Amino acid sequence: SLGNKLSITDVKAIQGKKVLVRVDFNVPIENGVIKDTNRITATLPTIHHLKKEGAAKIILISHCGRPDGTKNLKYTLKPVAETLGTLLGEEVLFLSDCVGEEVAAQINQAKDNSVILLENLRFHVEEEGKGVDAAGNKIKASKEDMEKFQNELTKLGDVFINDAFGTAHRAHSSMVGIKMNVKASGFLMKKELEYFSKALENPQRPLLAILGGAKVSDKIQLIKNLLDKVDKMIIGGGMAYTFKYVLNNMKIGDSLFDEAGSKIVNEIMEKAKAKNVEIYLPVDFKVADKFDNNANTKVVTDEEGIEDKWMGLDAGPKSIENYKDVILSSKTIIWNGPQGVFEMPNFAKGSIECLNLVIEATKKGAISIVGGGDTASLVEQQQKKNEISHVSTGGGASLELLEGKELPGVVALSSK
Numbered sequence: 001s002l003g004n005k006l007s008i009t010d011v012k013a014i015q016g017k018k019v020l021v022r023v024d025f026n027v028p029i030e031n032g033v034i035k036d037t038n039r040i041t042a043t044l045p046t047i048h049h050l051k052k053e054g055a056a057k058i059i060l061i062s063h064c065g066r067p068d069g070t071k072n073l074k075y076t077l078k079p080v081a082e083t084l085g086t087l088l089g090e091e092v093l094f095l096s097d098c099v100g101e102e103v104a105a106q107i108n109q110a111k112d113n114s115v116i117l118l119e120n121l122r123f124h125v126e127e128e129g130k131g132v133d134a135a136g137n138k139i140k141a142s143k144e145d146m147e148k149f150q151n152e153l154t155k156l157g158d159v160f161i162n163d164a165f166g167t168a169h170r171a172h173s174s175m176v177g178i179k180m181n182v183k184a185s186g187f188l189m190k191k192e193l194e195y196f197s198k199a200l201e202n203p204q205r206p207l208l209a210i211l212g213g214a215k216v217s218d219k220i221q222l223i224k225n226l227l228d229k230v231d232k233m234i235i236g237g238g239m240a241y242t243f244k245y246v247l248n249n250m251k252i253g254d255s256l257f258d259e260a261g262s263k264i265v266n267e268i269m270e271k272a273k274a275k276n277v278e279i280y281l282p283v284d285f286k287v288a289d290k291f292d293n294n295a296n297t298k299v300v301t302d303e304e305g306i307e308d309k310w311m312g313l314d315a316g317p318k319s320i321e322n323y324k325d326v327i328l329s330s331k332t333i334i335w336n337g338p339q340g341v342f343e344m345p346n347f348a349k350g351s352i353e354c355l356n357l358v359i360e361a362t363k364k365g366a367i368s369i370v371g372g373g374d375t376a377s378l379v380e381q382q383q384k385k386n387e388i389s390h391v392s393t394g395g396g397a398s399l400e401l402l403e404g405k406e407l408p409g410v411v412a413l414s415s416k
């Protein structure tokens with residue numbers, strides 16, 4: 001289950017507690033300078049709630065870069081402490097390790113209600129459970145080494161807050177081994193779990209999935225899992241040409257064709273029929289004579305097909321018209337994939353109209369979830385993030401959740 005997990009707002013006893021918080025501070029650092037501070041800024045509601053609720057210590061644990069289970073000061077969290085300090089308007093204490101008597105002593109010695117940032121968890125092989133030494137030899141932590149490191153992290157505090165949903169798909173020490181009585185989601189994780197629970201457990205129906213992207217192959221698990229939940233599915237973008245070719249023997253010219261993925265199209269269509277899911281493929285396309293925004297373009301229907309040396313780069317006007325009744329009658333929308341080459345303004349119309357319809361449905365009461373990646377970029381470029389119920393930032397974890405995979409970091413949270 002996803003919706004019955006304990007959240008930071010449900011925690012009653014916070015005053016005078018040492019609160020251990022797993023955050024996502026995997027920020028790009030260019031010679032001591034943080035170039036993107038969004039991940040740091042996104043943890044402020046969690047930190048503010050803990051300070052306001054009178055926490056004795058706010059102990060932050062995270063990772064960044066790729067140290068591979070070895071101390072590697074290129075991936076030091078030291079600059080993150082400085083940036084977080086500036087954002088908080090107070091000094092954030094940075095510690096050179098994350099476990100042990102010395103770290104414990106420094107935490108206890110710190111000013112009450114203050115914020116402490118511990119060094120990168122991934123400097124320890126026990127965090128990921130595997131790594132690589134300096135020489136390049138593979139190293140692995142034994143069950144006992146793992147258990148000892150997990151016990152050491154547990155000894156740092158009294159209450160555990162997991163605000164790192166983007167790492168919850170991993171059975172890492174900081175996701176599964178912090179054995180405190182209260183293990184609650186932080187505000188970021190709370191929102192992710194709340195909205196993914198709304199979309200996938202007992203959703204408000206009709207439930208619609210809007211899928212797109214360049215390939216079929218990397219979306220098979222996602223499609224097959226969503227066919228067990230949804231009532232309707234729009235399949236668009238580059239992946240649609242593979243479907244039109246296999247299903248209707250439609251000429252696709254130089255459009256994208258997924259050779260491995262083409263062999264699974266019939267299975268997908270057969271599962272959709274078994275599950276009584278309505279599939280909506282494009283019936284027309286905006287084609288181009290070159291892969292370029294300034295290409296010569298025209299509209300072809302799926303009855304005409306695409307001529308040799310031409311390529312489909314967006315859904316056509318009829319396919320765009322067909323979205324309207326599908327999207328506007330939907331009460332829950334999971335959107336994972338653009339409907340064309342949105343990076344080229346002349347082939348963004350299908351994706352932009354899909355966005356306008358999803359927004360319209362949301363204003364009228366639908367719950368809209370944007371999976372991430374390219375769809376999130378489109379919503380961001382169009383400046384419409386606040387018009388969508390939830391734009392997930394969980395990356396790989398959001399994708400695994402939608403593929404029906406186990407999230408160990410979620411499983412390890414307390415139940416409400």
Ligand SMILES: O=C1N[C@H](c2ccc([N+](=O)[O-])o2)Nc2sc3c(c21)CCCC3
Nearest residue numbers: 214237238291311312313314339340341
């Ligand atoms: O790299 C490419 N991707 C695009 C793509 C992505 C999504 C969609 N869509 O149509 O939605 O198309 N379509 C083509 S034709 C084409 C290329 C691409 C590369 C050069 C040869 C011709």
